[PDB]
């Protein structure tokens, strides 16, 4: 499972114990995100930034 990293021209293998997928985007540009990794349990979302978890390959 390999995803984008913060930069969505170039991706790598995601991390030893996380095999999900994330991405954070901010209120402000929310057309542009502000994190893009990988994790293990689906975050908490806030009011600030919205978190979501994808299994997909390239996703975020």
């Known amino acids: 499972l390999k995803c984008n990293k ?3 021209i170039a991706y790598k293998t995601c ?8 991405k954070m ?3 402000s ?5 502000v ?3 990988c994790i293990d349990v689906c975050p908490k979302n806030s009011l600030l930034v919205k978190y979501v978890c994808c ?5 975020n």
């Open 6 to 8: 913060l930069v969505p």
């Open 15 to 22: 991390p030893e114990g996380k095999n999900l997928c994330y």
């Open 25 to 27: 985007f901010m209120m």
């Open 29 to 33: 540009d929310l057309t542009i995100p």
């Open 35 to 37: 994190k893009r990794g």
């Open 55 to 59: 299994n997909t390959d390239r996703c």
